[PDB]
Design a binder for this molecule. Structure first.
Ligand SMILES: Nc1ncnc2c1ncn2[C@@H]1O[C@H](COP(=O)(O)OP(=O)(O)OP(=O)(O)O)[C@@H](O)[C@H]1O
Ligand SMILES: Nc1ncnc2c1ncn2[C@@H]1O[C@H](COP(=O)(O)OP(=O)(O)OP(=O)(O)O)[C@@H](O)[C@H]1O
Ligand SMILES: NS(=O)(=O)c1cc2c(cc1Cl)NCNS2(=O)=O
Lengths: 373, 898
């Protein structure tokens, strides 16, 4: 039995080497950063909901610290984790690596995990709920994980839940049918279509097939009808079957004074308080702490920070009771956006909700097409 | 303030232009910034009514409507006739639902049915179906024009104006009509549409004429022929069947009717001339099917409710009192057909007269015009469909010569060459003038096309790729499968030999296309299905519980660029193919760490090179500062679930003497890391080296002849040292090689004299033809070779005889490769064993195809890396044949065996 299963698996995996890649056949192959899969069952459940027998799903665990690999204990624990995953009826592969820190292990997994064409192209990581009351080095490493994911051409998906992800198996929200609630999609920027593909595949399961999908797109106050018509036409060309389209004409409006003050206080303990010197003469103080923010950087990114804090209000007043909130994840340029600022943006976009909030971002490459080549 | 969202950022908002590959009406096609830009530092068109509904409706309507349907309803009755019509309609409607679903997924271009099938199912089946469809349409035009010519000949003969003879008149009339049709079609699609609309109007007028005639009271002529206007008695009597003649069977009527009304793809074959095909094809096709079905049912019922089955046709057969004995209902209206019924010799009535529908109608010439219009419309539709489908097929370039056709022309790329080819084929088949033995073949070709359409829909639905998002959601994959299966069953039930011919042609064309390996990548359910199968079986393997009963040698071959060292890949693939996983690992030193599109292109090129050598392996490339780190990454993460490597295959670095010692340090470190990861190590050495920098040849690609494979088993590693040569010896290139095992089985393991070696060899079922014992290992080697070894190791000596163990590492802090005097004196006997074993190997295995030796192991810290490399060098040196130094994982590989 095992021999025959291995033979079939190997034959088909090798045969897949001959098949060429096409946009019509694009599949989201997810590398889920779960650690021990029983610690964060919400991530596993959510990813397996839309990945089940549709695309590759890998649960990545990084064993921090130095060790001479091998040993029978590593295999025993890997077998235990695989058994736990199988008991939950989750079609996923468990993969663990040994590295000095989380960033190195994630890099190893993103570089080597997979088999031929069956290799991940999306990174799914949980939100760092405790990023403020923690050593800034950890925050820098987390943002560096995101940066490495982008550097490898991966699509990034950040999952946030109100109570966090770290906890007979545990039961999560994604094991129960959502019902008539709505999946709210905020397609603010063109990333290729990942922001839409993930919710579309999610709604193709029986647990989310009853949810009404709402798409929110930015626009102009004097061209709302035209923008709505154009976006509806685009969605119909994609044949995604999304119900409602809303246009937000006030994303550039200045946010309330209380919320901007809250955002300012959030990054207060990361202010390097040195933004009156040349960038050349400001990296000396960052040599040991490459996470502080310089007043020049804050002055340049003020508009983007305000846009983040205002998008939070827009989401709060629209998606208060949705079953899922999908927001396009903003991109911060390397070297011009300190890890603290990126973390603050991610915290500000998703807050004060009851969030199954997903921040998605494709690699700027089309994953949808209205063509049959 | 209140300006356009996105005016103050590099990121762009979603717009249609970012996804279109067409020509931008305004300026050029805008392109969204690449991820590195944001990241990183520093022509007439037709509507659905005139384009699809009219065309499909005219295609479905044929001559059976006027000349056969009344006969079928007379023979089988109204109920059985409705059953036949409904069965045909279920088949056709399932096919239409499938085509509608397949036709709403992206934007469809010119190519009609062939385009949809090929783009949804792959070039393999698509090309064969396209060729068959084009040929079938080119012959259907001839069949329809022959029907029209036969009708014209019958009319002329009835009028007494024949030209030459019944057979030749058909030839002349058909040739002239087909020429006129060709002229009409070459004038453009506007004139073709005008002609289609004219024929539709003529058919509608014919229907109105028949309906009006069926209501007026019956005249003496009509009455004496069975027509009596709607009567409850006639309707009731005409419900049960009344079979007659050699064809009076249900299957006979079904075979007459079904192939006559199935042409539902007429509208979808001009998809390149529609405005919004995704909106017009489904609606038009389904409406056409519904309306044609309604017309068939209504005609059947009305004709069966008005005409009796038998009628003499003579006006003298009126019923009067005194003479004759009336029989049947016909004698209740004052008509006596008793004599005809008794002798069964009357030529009038629903069952005996073939033109009863024309007699009933108020003007027979209108019925004749309706027949003319139906036949000509079918011929024109077939001509246009064949031309368009063939032009698309030739555009795709799946065949070696048909490429000539397909040259579009002014404005609309009209395939004039395709029109000429179709007209030539139609004329050639008309010249025969006899097609009763060819018509079943064409019908079965159309049925094959229907089955392929249905299977395309079903396969796309079952695969469920994320790109399969049809906007028409009123289909069922199970219904599509039933439609395909029933289409094949009907094809075999009608003209089974014709069905065999059609299936054989389809298979031959598919085999040709598959062998030709077309260079088209459209994205099909077949590729998505291949991915589905791979994922499903990998997950199934993962589900199976871990157990030792399925050991396989899963090799991670460090080849760098695969074309650089093809000997390594060839050797590993020899014993890995069809048995276990093989991964070709390539490490890129690289400045920093990134993966741009160029890296993906290079990886695709390497994979293509690997697949062009018929080698079953995965190419994996990683970025690392040095080779050792890349190998660590590969050994840590490479693989998927249970299909992960457990053997490391690396080449011998013959340049270690002349190179920075840090490089040899890192090489030995790679070996030690593989050992520490519970990997099996396998070092390959050749006198010419592995780096050879179409396909380069390699000694492993050739026959080995009678040369012998020599194994020097010096340590019990679990069986890999013997597993590899055994697996190698099962191939057709190593079969003639005689395997010799020089069993120094267990040096420091209490080896048995003769019993244990033979027992283990038998348990390995290796067919070891010879077993030799070489106990002359501890013997001191010749002084010359000892001096050679001393010379090779001299440069790495640290000269630390008087220095202690505690202080030796001090000067080693920056040069850990250097040897220590105490280390030299400790690894002296074990170092001379290497030279002695080299002596033995050199004297025994000098004409062997392959040499396998146990890989020495160097203990970390107390065995300097340079000394380990020296041992490896001395062990395998001066040997012409390839040398493989192996050391198993200490895990029982005997479980691999049956
Ligand atoms: N050892 C690990 N292997 C793989 N992914 C990890 C590992 N540790 C953390 N992660 C990922 O990083 C994310 C953030 O983890 P982090 O610990 O920084 O925040 P947290 O989960 O709020 O804290 P805690 O783990 O103490 O609950 C998690 O969602 C998880 O997906
Ligand atoms: N970039 C690489 N990726 C993977 N393996 C490598 C790479 N470079 C070298 N190797 C492996 O290390 C071995 C020694 O290579 P090295 O360049 O150190 O010596 P060499 O004599 O140049 O080897 P070769 O004769 O194969 O070129 C090779 O047999 C090869 O298998
Ligand atoms: N012209 S067509 O390709 O649409 C077509 C014609 C006929 C069919 C089927 C099709 Cl798809 N079957 C019945 N004989 S037909 O009218 O020539």
């Amino acid at each position: 039995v095992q021999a025959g299963s291995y033979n079939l698996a190997l034959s088909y995996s090798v045969g897949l080497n001959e098949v060429e890649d096409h946009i019509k056949n694009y599949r989201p192959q997810c590398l889920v950063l779960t650690g021990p899969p029983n610690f964060r069952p919400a991530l596993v459940d959510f990813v397996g909901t839309f990945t089940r027998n549709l695309s590759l799903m890998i649960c990545g665990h990084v064993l921090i610290g130095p060790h001479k690999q091998r040993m029978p204990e590593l295999q025993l624990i890997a077998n235990g984790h695989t058994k736990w995953l199988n008991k939950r009826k989750i079609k996923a592969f468990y993969s663990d690596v040994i590295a000095e820190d989380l960033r190195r292990g994630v890099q190893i997994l993103m570089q080597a995990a997979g088999l031929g064409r069956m290799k991940p192209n999306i990174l799914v990581v949980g939100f760092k709920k405790n990023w403020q009351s923690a050593h800034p080095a950890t925050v820098e490493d987390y943002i560096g994980i995101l940066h490495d994911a982008f550097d490898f051409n991966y699509g990034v998906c950040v999952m946030r839940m109100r109570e966090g992800l770290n906890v007979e198996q545990a039961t999560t929200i994604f094991q129960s049918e959502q019902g008539k609630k709505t999946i709210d999609i905020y397609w603010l920027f063109d990333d290729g279509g990942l922001t839409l593909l993930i919710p579309y595949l999610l709604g193709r399961k029986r647990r989310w097939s009853k949810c009404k999908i709402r798409v929110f797109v930015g626009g102009q106050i004097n061209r709302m009808d035209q923008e709505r018509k154009a976006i509806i036409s685009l969605l119909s060309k994609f044949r995604l079957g999304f119900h409602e389209v809303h246009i937000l004409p006030d994303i550039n409006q200045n946010p309330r004074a209380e919320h901007t003050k809250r955002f300012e206080d959030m990054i207060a303990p990361f202010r390097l308080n040195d933004g009156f010197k040349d960038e050349a003469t400001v990296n000396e103080m960052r040599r040991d702490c490459p996470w502080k923010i310089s007043d020049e950087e804050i002055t340049k990114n003020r508009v983007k920070s305000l846009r983040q804090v205002r998008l939070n209000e827009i989401v709060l007043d629209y998606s208060r009771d949705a079953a899922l909130i999908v927001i396009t994840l903003p991109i911060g340029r390397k070297g011009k956006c300190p890890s603290s600022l990126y973390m603050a943006w991610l915290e500000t976009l998703s807050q004060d909700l009851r969030p199954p909030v997903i921040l998605i971002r494709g690699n700027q490459e089309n994953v949808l097409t209205f063509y049959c080549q």
